[PDB]
Symmetry: D2
Subunit: 276 residues, 4 copies
């Protein structure tokens, strides 16, 4: 009695919750100064571009790696932008490794304000009907779904401990559409799972954090023939693949105070690919 109780999440407490106090200047909303970001898969590709953009925005950055040493990448951020950066080696497929890596990052930086769950794996084996060995399926799920959940489960405890945070899960247009002509049902499945995990966690963590996805389309960064890429261009309204530098604005948007009412959303950056 005497309380408007949420239908979504009672841990919100009596409603309405209070809006944050923000700068009246839109440009200040995007600064990450005074914040710690942890960006997985940041030894290259999208994760590196996001890690570097967050440093530009003023954030201390924990980069992750596994196959290739990124200590000099983390050192490069320190030297270039005057920000604390350290690199961490971890197999995202191993939940104990994730727990220890996250626990260690909390010690070195003090806290974590922004987390980017950036799971990189692809399915290149064609139609699944001819892949009788479930090791390919199971490897996609372990890295691209379980590995994303391990990171989320651990970072949510830190967000709740601190009463604040912003989790970004890197999904894909493959979470919304079925890629053609390269058939990759297992990858599309894990990415769709990622997208709806982010929305589910958005409800569960709303008293202490925001959760959103970025869904990139075809970004210029393997076994893609010229005639395959040609078909991608033909079906993309802008007519080309994107650049990693065209993703960083969306990742900064979701990481910062520019999006404090944005949760459970999927920011699609795909040159229009999902529209036809």
């Amino acid at each position: 009695m005497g309380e408007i109780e949420s239908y979504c999440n009672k841990e919100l407490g009596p409603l309405p919750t209070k809006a944050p106090t923000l700068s009246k200047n839109v440009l200040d909303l995007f600064s990450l100064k005074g914040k710690v970001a942890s960006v997985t898969g940041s030894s290259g590709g999208i994760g590196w571009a996001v890690a570097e953009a967050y440093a530009q925005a003023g954030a201390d950055v924990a980069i992750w790696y596994n196959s290739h040493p990124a200590d000099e990448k983390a050192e490069h951020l320190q030297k270039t932008y005057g920000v604390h950066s350290k690199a961490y080696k971890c197999n995202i497929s191993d939940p104990k490794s994730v727990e220890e890596t996250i626990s260690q990052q909390e010690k070195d930086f003090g806290t974590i304000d922004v987390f980017v769950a950036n799971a990189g794996v692809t399915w290149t084996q064609g139609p699944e009907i001819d892949v009788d060995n479930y090791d390919s399926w199971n490897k996609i799920i372990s890295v691209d779904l379980n590995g994303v959940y391990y990171c989320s489960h651990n970072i949510g405890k830190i967000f709740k401990k601190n009463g604040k945070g912003s989790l970004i899960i890197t999904s894909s247009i493959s979470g919304k559409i079925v890629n053609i002509p390269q058939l990759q049902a297992p990858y599309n499945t894990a990415k769709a799972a990622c997208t709806h995990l982010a929305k589910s966690l958005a409800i569960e963590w709303a008293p202490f954090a925001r959760v959103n996805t970025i869904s990139p389309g075809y970004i210029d960064t393997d076994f893609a023939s010229k005639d395959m890429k040609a078909k991608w261009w033909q079906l993309t309204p802008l007519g080309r693949e994107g650049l990693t530098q065209e993703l960083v604005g969306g990742y900064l948007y979701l990481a910062s105070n520019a999006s404090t009412f944005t949760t459970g959303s999927d920011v699609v950056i795909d040159g229009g690919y999902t529209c036809p």
Copy 2:
């Protein structure tokens, strides 16, 4: 050169593919006379409803169980409707088991025309943050996603061998929305996966089969009072559904009533996903 080649799947051959001959009368399109259906999770709940309606439509039905013997339920189908029916035990979380089960089923009935992948593992443990056993996460992913993929992977080979088939994956409104107030992110995740797996397989199997999902809302089958009251308040029709309100959609997707329907998600939820 000279052919129109699909951008979706070159196994379609030169385009356009050709349409089937269909009955002149709309009611005959829904008949399963002459067909074999295999319905997982069929010892009760939604699965049993579907298996019985398929026999009413005239189908031989393989029912599945895991908990209690369903042989008598299969005998009821055989007795009441005059069709072939048998019960099979399998842990769909184990691929050898489902492979051997589906292999045995096509031996026993000759073929499989209609398959319903129905997973039944639920998440009852509240917000995931306080559940430090990935055992519950792993259990949901293993049965509700991996298990559905094992059935799919195996039934596709049969459909491709025969050049025909209809796969229905039972998903949930949880594949589209986030249930409240009972928080169940792992369940929602697996059901969204199933929904997009179906769409992906629809492209891959298009030369020989259709793949669609049914997404039920809140169905009163075989939850606190205040919880259910909130579900009712948020449901446009104002109530939970009955299993008899699902079988029409399952028969639609199973039969020649839907021969141009593939990769679709048939939502049966009293409007729940609309507000």
Copy 3:
């Protein structure tokens, strides 16, 4: 006090509402015997196929026409299936004509149980940037949106008077995706509007009726070159255009007691076109 009040629609009364009593036989759920259906745009194409399938299911059928006489079509249903059928001439763009036509149909058949709002118009003028005359835009909206709303607004009063009904709005994949290579923004806009009108009405009419859409893909029934259709086939997972006879099962599904828990839904029949 003493009442669970809907958050959706208080006219539902105290919750839960009561489920209908249905046949225990699935095949009986699809019969339309004892019911009156009104199918607009039924002088040919999809509307004719639906009108004939409903007669096969046992329903009395009111067919609509405007440009071509359908009296002999309505007469053909009577002679062939032993069902009451009459044809009505009406310009769906004129709201008074719609009101009078619906009011007249209620008299002749006694009631209306099933209504199919089947608005037929297309945009063939290419990209809108070069159509400076708004008469093309306004004609699409008037027929494909306003005309659908006129029919709905009028049939809802009859459904509410009787406490029962099933409205089906014929939408299109164009309501969900952007057709290519033929550019038709005005048509896609009206069809998207239709799809979300159906969901909106589903909430508002839930005490007395169900509202759903059928969204056909490319169905073989104008100014479509061979190379245009070729591109449609290439992007369609089944690899072909559909037949009108592949739509009637979905229209029967939504019209009958097979779908009494189905409301606010969009049944897509498109050979998979919206999946890539």
Copy 4:
């Protein structure tokens, strides 16, 4: 022959098209320094928030009004941020008016780089079945859909002439879900139309412009208590949003921060569309 021709729009020319040069520093991508923005419905509410944030980002801003004089609001922008600004009166429901307004605006500022189509007609009359005046329906469709199309139709010619542009259409969560308990089917219909119009124009304008939507949830701008309480109960964040929580997205879509973003729908709703 020899070229790769788009399946979306042959006006793209031989594929692939080419990417723009962009600033090395992510913060510079958000600058509107050197650009002209035109924001409809800009005498207050969301529109004014957007117009002021664009000037903060360094943009010349044309503001629109229809009710009260906004010339002073435009003078405030000119005074506080050191940019060009002017207020224009127009009934966006009348195409001659918006055509003449937009023509006058490109004359006064030289060009238009960013356009925000923001319609503000709301439906407050409850369930449509008791509203026998299509005057309210026609009013919503005329302003919230036709009016948005008139602005779009006219600004596209400018973008195409200049080979550059970003159009943001303000839609609503009402374009995706059905608001409860206040029933407003005509508003929901027009907003869904706007959302798909934006996607359609994104394909058509791709050789020279980007088109995206912002879909705000419940924003407390300038409704009974029990009504708002239910909105809060159904919002995952547990509150209404502030206009200052929208301007980040509007600046993202307006600027070179989003040069690969087109046909997208940026939802800012506290999670409302998730359950």
